[PDB]
Design a protein around this ligand. Structure first.
Ligand SMILES: Nc1ncnc2c1ncn2[C@@H]1O[C@H](COP(=O)(O)OP(=O)(O)O)[C@@H](O)[C@H]1O
Ligand SMILES: Nc1ncnc2c1ncn2[C@@H]1O[C@H](COP(=O)(O)OP(=O)(O)O)[C@@H](O)[C@H]1O
Ligand SMILES: NC(=O)CC[C@H](N)C(=O)O
Ligand SMILES: NC(=O)CC[C@H](N)C(=O)O
Ligand SMILES: NCCC[C@H](N)C(=O)O
Ligand SMILES: NCCC[C@H](N)C(=O)O
Ligand SMILES: [Cl-]
Ligand SMILES: [Cl-]
Ligand SMILES: [Cl-]
Ligand SMILES: [K+]
Ligand SMILES: [K+]
Ligand SMILES: [K+]
Ligand SMILES: [Mn+2]
Ligand SMILES: [Mn+2]
Ligand SMILES: [Mn+2]
Ligand SMILES: [Mn+2]
Lengths: 344, 342
């Protein structure tokens, strides 16, 4: 039970509703990264570098992610790598470890180190073909990475993307929204020749009801307002018609895009809710920040879930979704055997 | 000091701040009829259909001669109704009668048994010198006697538009109403109502252009009708901006204007846009003492920044038509106008 307070007024708000309390600076607009590795005290083997789709702030357990990274630069990855190696020795890791980082403005911040096997290990095993748990078990038991012949990091020739599935449909009274707390129950895996294809497969696997046509509802927060323009642009290119709420429509009109204006519930009828219920939408991108706004936007997400409309609550996620629009999840299949055989 | 009270709550409001009480004829076409009665016959001087509806003082309304929308039938009714009143009041000379047409029904606004301010307009449009004829009539020469018996419907359209002094009193809301505030008038002559209206408009010192961006911010009762107006403008090459509610309805009819914020809504808002030259044309209709009071900035702004604005949908439609006309294309002399008359 933790959240992101945005100001002093907010701190009271919280501190009240809630024992030493931890206070950390929230790296906003940051890319979260997961790194799984194995140290034998003599060497460090990088298992995999995963770039999350959802930004830091959406728990890693609930974020979609890609192996290899889809936006981060080698240079930035090389830092993370050195960092993992240094931590490994300092901490005296013997076996598996996991390192979580936040990247902001080309700077690498450490979020946490988990010196045990992480929930991402199976996914990395499956994507890289290296059975990490086995390797690390042999390491803990006395066989070095060198003795094992597993010393070099493996970068597959294909993209592997992990998507999660959430239990929100089992508890309708909960706001089916992402945050610092993990609520997912499982994961899926998508493999493609491009991040767009891997993503489309993961998306389809995750039981998404996304379509490649119709009308999309855009209602995002301030910090997303500028960037949502390009997404609406990508959406229009794909053939969708757009709807937007007040302020979202304002930002878009100024960029030259004119969505159809829809009313919030307090605003009038028909409103967003009526529209969702009538099946007007096939896609919904809805981002919020701050306890209140969240509370207030509730109806969009519950309705979306309820009515089976695909929805994204992060812009990064919205952009992933858009790229996948240019891929066909059903076009080609590959076996794990074949995948591992491709490995160089 | 005439006001239009919307509801009960609205009356005290007046009452307090503040007797004849009358039912306001909403969405009605106002008409002015100038005539002559000699006790023997009645000469219809001119039937003028105002562009702005009843509720906007005739003195501040643009008007047309002949009527551009009224039915021959409806007008024949008026004609007869004026003749009935001429005799009844025993008019001898000039008279003016003001009507309102609501739902194909003719209602009586007022009778002015004297020369009215439209006379010179009618005289010019119709080539008949109404003040001279009526003078003679008053002095003893019958209409018969003068050879002035038939009503004249010119072959062309004559439109009158007014000029308002708001620019001289900036602190005043540049909005039309039941009280007259205009100082003068202009006349536009064309082969079509649109041509005549264009000429009236340009003669009145309008800053309207045939390109740019139009701002649409209308009231409830105009939301439906505003759809057709936006269509027109888009068709003339105008881009559209709209305030929340108005955008809503447009959107629901397939038109997506770029939304603009009201001043309390955020930035930039209407005032920044007006001030910044984003608009060449503004349509802003309002209802309610409150509503008017809160929308004041749009109108003061448009005035201050010389943006052509219409405060009535009818005016809007008239302006929209004029866009298909060219006020500089052709010219005609009064003599030429007059000769063209049967
Ligand atoms: N300083 C921070 N800045 C931004 N996001 C953070 C920060 N600390 C934690 N988070 C986010 O919250 C999630 C949960 O935090 P973490 O420290 O990894 O806790 P847990 O032990 O429950 O996994 C992280 O995956 C990350 O998205
Ligand atoms: N009952 C009414 N319904 C609607 N509009 C009206 C009504 N009575 C007057 N008006 C409006 O007010 C204007 C002025 O009304 P009028 O009785 O002629 O006053 P005045 O003495 O100033 O001529 C009319 O030209 C018309 O626009
Ligand atoms: N970013 C948002 O979702 C804005 C809040 C939400 N639309 C509401 O009804 O309050
Ligand atoms: N119909 C109107 O003129 C709307 C009112 C106005 N825009 C305001 O800011 O209150
Ligand atoms: N990776 C988490 C699930 C994403 C969900 N569509 C949301 O964006 O809220
Ligand atoms: N005939 C009155 C002047 C018109 C002015 N543009 C308005 O509509 O307020
Ligand atoms: Cl874990
Ligand atoms: Cl529940
Ligand atoms: Cl008069
Ligand atoms: K994340
Ligand atoms: K830890
Ligand atoms: K009028
Ligand atoms: Mn963690
Ligand atoms: Mn942890
Ligand atoms: Mn009058
Ligand atoms: Mn009078």
């Amino acid at each position: 039970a933790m959240e992101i307070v945005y100001d002093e007024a907010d701190l009271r708000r919280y501190f009240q509703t809630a024992a030493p309390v931890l206070l950390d600076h929230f790296l906003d607009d940051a890319v979260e990264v997961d790194v799984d590795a194995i140290c034998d005290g003599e060497m460090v083997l990088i298992g995999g570098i995963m770039e999350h789709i959802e930004q830091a702030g959406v728990h890693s357990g609930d974020s979609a992610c890609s192996l290899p990274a889809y936006t981060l630069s080698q240079e930035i990855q090389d830092v993370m790598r050195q960092q993992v190696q240094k931590l490994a020795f300092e901490l005296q890791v013997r076996g598996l470890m996991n390192v979580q980082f936040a990247v902001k403005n080309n700077e690498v911040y450490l979020i946490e180190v988990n010196p045990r096997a992480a929930r991402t290990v199976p996914f990395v095993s499956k994507a890289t073909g290296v059975p990490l748990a086995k390797v690390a078990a042999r390491v803990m038991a006395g066989k070095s990475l060198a003795e094992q012949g597993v010393t070099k990091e493996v970068i597959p020739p294909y993209y592997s993307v992990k998507e999660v599935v959430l239990p929100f449909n089992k508890f309708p009274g909960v706001d089916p929204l992402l945050g610092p707390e993990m609520r997912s129950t499982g994961e899926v895996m998508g493999v493609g020749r491009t991040f767009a294809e891997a993503f489309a497969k993961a998306q389809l696997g995750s039981n998404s009801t996304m379509k490649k046509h119709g009308r999309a509802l855009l209602s995002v927060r301030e910090g997303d307002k500028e960037r949502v323009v390009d997404l609406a642009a990508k959406l229009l290119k794909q053939g969708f018609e757009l709807d937007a709420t007040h302020g979202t429509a304002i930002v878009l009109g100024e960029a030259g895009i004119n969505p159809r204006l829809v009313n919030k519930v307090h605003e009038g009828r028909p409103h967003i809710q009526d529209r969702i219920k009538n099946g007007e939408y096939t896609y919904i991108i809805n981002t919020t920040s701050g306890r209140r706004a969240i509370e207030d936007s509730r109806v969009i997400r519950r309705s979306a879930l309820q009515y089976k409309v695909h929805y994204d609550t992060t812009l990064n996620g919205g952009f992933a979704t858009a790229m996948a629009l240019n891929a066909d999840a059903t076009e080609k299949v590959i076996s794990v055997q074949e995948m591992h055989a491709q490995i160089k």
